[PDB]
Ligand binder design. Structure first.
Ligand code: NAD
Ligand code: NAD
Ligand code: NAD
Ligand code: NAD
Ligand code: ZN
Ligand code: ZN
Ligand code: ZN
Ligand code: ZN
Ligand code: ZN
Ligand code: ZN
Ligand code: ZN
Ligand code: ZN
Lengths: 347, 347, 347, 347
């Protein structure tokens, strides 16, 4: 089968011809019908997230097929698989745990001590077929098609968990930083669909700000055209925002938005652009603000985003679909910030 | 009446003779029987917490009587006060809110927009008498004497709130940084009394480490005699700690202990030594750690620490009591780190 | 001023001429612009909730002006009131606490040991003016008019609290019993606006079922035309519902809907029709279901429903407005179940 | 191997000679070193819990080996088992789920749609060996011996979950009904070890009341010697208790203790004696009390009780150990209420 893999750090992904794996035990072989392209693949291709080298620091062994936003058709199942037939369309949660470690036992599968992350340290969906380590991480699609579903296995589940950690309610205001992108448009949608909170989206490109407006943001700010702090101060009447979901975490965002936090404000850190958080400690203490990291999601979150989307309450804003052979171009679009919403590969 | 007040920044507190206030409305005039000395008064005397000047940045108007760990006898009450008689011994929650702002309405009175903090921006207990803005912030002592009670209105309520925010349970390990001090000995006790969690206390003085051992810590480390990270790594079997309560937040603690956090670890920031938090953002995100500020406590927290102490489940470790005229010497002991547990003034 | 009061149990409310109270201290005199009519006033007029006599069992002292859904204009304030001017339009939370008891201290003011409930044990809004015990229980209207606001001080805040206690999320299904009524239409809206959960509304009148459909229910059932259990079984695919908000709690509802609960299901009991809950204990234990009572709401809940409505995310379905002199007729409509949505008096 | 099994309802358990199962896949064959005797086995032998027949209503297929408090030595593992060696001493969580259903995905394994409950619908520990469906449900003992550990797999995990659902804190009072029994002594211990709450234990036998006193109860009541309601009213100063953990749920307890609940009180229903809950609905609503069922525990709870016990913070009060051949006599002791604490079989 054809596969687009990360063969060498700092080089374009490589289109290779490799064998189709045989599913055994609880594994499932999925015929890929859609593979979302995440800005994380820009970092993968660069070989790192900040100063955390995927090889030396995270244990990633090259070559590896990328693609962790997964949706497809069941081709073959192992002997232990129960509840699926050939042809069934499913979304796949790629953040899998082995089930016995501390984190797996308390329902935090994605923080497993021996993680199996399809598209990161295990082969992903940028191919004709993909192996699912365990069938319990799949979701039978009922209303969604594969293209709409794929993005939910990362951008959806990640922002669903992030919106929950932001502890939002009708009396609060949320600020989404980088609201016009893949996760940004998703964070805005979920917050609109289930929190009742007022939403402010900020980006730095005309089309991105427009995308955030389309995603449902009550207020949108173009940080290139105006001072976002003055505007946020105006919108919240000097109270500041109760929560920020930063989908960048660059020196540009981290040196600005934490100052917009209200007392008890939660700064949810999702983006992986690679900067260092730097804030005066007494200021954190006196305002009781929090800086909380959020990583993809667990089985519970997956269930949550999939049911929300199946109900039509949220829907990935797919602005572009292209062939698997165009994986590098789709990634260049994110690296050059020439994309909005989400792009999906349709092998 | 005699009062020890902060008259000038960077100078010794001043013993003055001032008028005794007349309680009106819901106010209450308390005859001070005990006034705890907090390391925060070292910062007050220096005129700042980190680079946050108490005058220009926090609105503190000099002169102001210090002393926010309050316990005493009811001398006189206003016309609105209901439920107290002259002579009743009470502990006083000094972190008072006006009751109508957003934070007061959601039960976070210490984060009131118009805070009345006895000993900080309003006169405190380093005097013969002290005015209590509102009687609902008092607790009638049933078993505790004034000396034992006073420290609970700051070191107790603060660390009670911090231990709650650390989200501890029997499967977790807590690390208390500066465990031999006033708050340190209290954090260790509360965590021992109600979380079931394993406790590690770290300090840098032989007597402090011993105090932390006496407070109930399962493991104690003298960071002056050995590498605390190697030891914490050994105790937690390389898992790291699920929570840290840092009662320093100095460049020395912040550049070390965050590295000891396990995945999902919570770094509760209480200390006000004045450094800057600096940590690689991708590391925060990938391990889902959190840096959360905690400030004194609300009416709910107060109730919690007072009942815990009245039941004899925790008890401030008072290692020294002295006269009100000795306020500066007691503060010097904290500034020079020549104290353990808690010191209390007995006017 | 004119007032419609409960003078005698089992008799029509009485239109009387009484003196206008003078606001002192933190009290506020409100010129009533709208007074919602709640089915609770049907019980008040009958002198009881189930077998709990309002006089002998609850301490209600007759005569008392009814009306606890309050919205109006500030006429006069006491000496302590801060932040309001004559003419300001406000909604009033009638479930007031004195502020010092255990329940007031933990932010559950409606469960105060010495409750001041306007319209129940204190004079209410079925009059030209009404006294507000404490100004902190008011909310300044920004977008809502008085008629739209009034119902939020009971049907809104109550069902907001009930929807929160139902612990809903996108993977869950909520069942609202009596969904076409005043609270029913509100419960459905709030659940639609902030939980992401699938909603099933059930009633027994064609117009009520239609109202519930208009409120946003995904599925509606007329228990008079069909077996509600068979239908709920079909909709949830035999899983049952994760939560039920019963706005009746009659022998007719309690002997039916608890059987529709899924494992861990929460049966939120709001209605006061007066029956006895009867369920096999082993069944409760083995399926971990819960029967939880919910009563009006606290200051936090009030804030939540008011902000949700001001944002236009929910809006009371007012199906009828009439003059204060018509109070008895409006109550008869609820007693005879010849009403849907909410009725509001406009003195 | 020898096994004590439920062969016929209403008859004494039968000592049979059956084959030793062969562990395959993730299964594990454990050599039983201790098997706790639970009052649930009295109900099993009677063929029902209340009016819920274990055969017709729960799907239990006879014959079945009883015994769900499990601790033993690893004899043999399947091909998928990872992390264990022959001889390793482990405690076994018998409340196992298949891992794919809704409840398994949200971390509520014990509420699995296709439950595998060792000792209930699958063979248990009342034998020489026992098969563990999945190895991830085991806990490697480090400090506890098998006899001390076994009881934690039911009485411990169940009461750990129940104490957590009681939402206890230092300002609250807990009432344990049947506090001198197997679960009672455990509930009292855990509440003493991790809640900070004041504890009241009630029983009706002199030795049972004494056992509850030894378990750590602050107050003990013998309901045979005095009116428990008058005493509870006295202890709580008429406030009532914030939580009740009823380990009976008989007409005798259910018609008494709910009346002792404070406003917002939580009545946790654990016992399976078989009565019907009957309480006036308006009373539930007006006091916001809750009746919540609690069933054994999930993987998270198991981790919690095992770590609490390994730390020596709680310890089953084993008052009797006897041979496997004496299973019926041990059960008669519970059925006749001639036992306190916990009894363990040592095959
Ligand atoms: N924590 C997790 O589990 C997780 C999961 C998925 C992706 N991510 C990370 O999230 C980040 C975003 O991913 P994505 O797929 O949404 O990317 P994207 O390229 O679709 O969107 C990024 C957005 O950031 C905006 N942006 C750039 N500079 C900005 C500035 N100075 N201020 C405000 N906005 C700015 C862009 O205009 C763009 O709309 C990446 O670093 C990715 O690796 C994290
Ligand atoms: N956030 C809040 O609401 C709040 C409330 C009260 C106090 N505080 C702050 O908490 C801090 C501690 O106050 P306290 O009264 O306990 O002080 P303290 O002087 O009693 O104790 C401080 C402890 O820190 C230890 N220490 C010093 N250097 C150390 C190092 N490098 N590593 C480890 N331990 C070290 C000392 O030996 C001492 O035992 C102060 O900065 C104070 O202002 C904050
Ligand atoms: N717990 C609280 O704090 C609180 C607050 C407000 C009102 N209430 C109580 O809530 C109840 C409802 O009040 P409301 O103002 O919404 O009343 P309402 O008269 O507006 O609505 C009641 C609804 O119940 C429906 N109904 C009647 N019989 C039914 C049956 N057998 N099955 C299903 N639906 C049926 C009616 O058709 C109607 O739509 C009253 O008992 C009231 O006292 C409680
Ligand atoms: N929900 C669950 O998951 C779960 C788990 C284990 C056991 N259980 C159930 O818990 C119940 C208790 O089990 P156990 O093993 O502790 O039993 P046990 O026999 O050890 O203890 C029961 C206690 O109840 C006391 N008692 C009897 N009548 C009483 C009365 N009128 N008032 C107060 N106390 C009274 C006895 O004196 C005795 O100490 C059983 O019905 C059992 O099936 C439930
Ligand atoms: Zn991604
Ligand atoms: Zn794992
Ligand atoms: Zn202090
Ligand atoms: Zn305030
Ligand atoms: Zn009402
Ligand atoms: Zn009160
Ligand atoms: Zn049992
Ligand atoms: Zn299952």
């Amino acid at each position: 089968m054809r596969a687009v893999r990360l063969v060498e750090i700092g080089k374009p992904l490589s289109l290779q011809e490799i064998g189709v794996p045989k599913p055994k035990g609880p594994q499932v072989l999925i015929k890929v019908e859609a593979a979302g392209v995440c800005h994380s693949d820009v970092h993968m291709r660069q070989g790192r997230f900040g100063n955390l080298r995927i090889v030396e620091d995270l244990g990633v062994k090259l070559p590896v097929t990328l693609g962790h936003e997964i949706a497809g058709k069941i081709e073959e199942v192992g002997d232990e698989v129960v509840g699926y037939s050939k042809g069934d369309l499913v979304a796949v949660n790629p953040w899998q745990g082995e089930g016995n470690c501390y984190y797996c036992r308390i329902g935090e599968e994605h923080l497993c001590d021996s993680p199996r992350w399809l598209g990161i340290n295990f082969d992903g969906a940028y191919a004709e077929y993909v192996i699912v380590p365990h069938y319990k991480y799949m979701y039978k699609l009922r209303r969604l098609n594969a293209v709409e579903a794929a993005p939910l296995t990362c951008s959806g589940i990640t922002t669903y968990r992030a919106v929950r950690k932001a502890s939002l309610d009708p009396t609060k205001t949320l600020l989404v930083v980088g609201a016009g992108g893949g996760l940004g448009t998703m964070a805005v949608q979920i917050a609109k669909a289930v929190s009742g909170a007022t939403i402010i989206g900020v980006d730095v490109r005309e089309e991105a700000v427009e995308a955030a407006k389309r995603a449902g943001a009550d207020y949108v700010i173009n940080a290139s055209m105006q001072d976002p702090l003055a505007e946020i101060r105006r919108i919240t009447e000097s109270k500041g925002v109760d929560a920020v979901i930063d989908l960048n975490n660059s020196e540009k965002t981290l040196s600005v938005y934490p100052k917009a936090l209200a007392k008890q404000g939660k700064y949810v850190m999702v983006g992986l652009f690679g900067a260092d958080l730097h804030y005066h400690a007494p200021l954190i203490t006196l305002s009781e603000i929090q800086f909380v990291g959020s990583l993809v999601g667990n089985q519970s979150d997956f269930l949550g985003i999939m049911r929300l989307a199946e109900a039509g309450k949220v829907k990935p804003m797919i602005t572009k679909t292209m062939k698997l052979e165009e994986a590098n171009e789709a990634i260049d679009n994110l690296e050059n910030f020439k994309a909005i919403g989400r792009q999906v590969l349709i092998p």
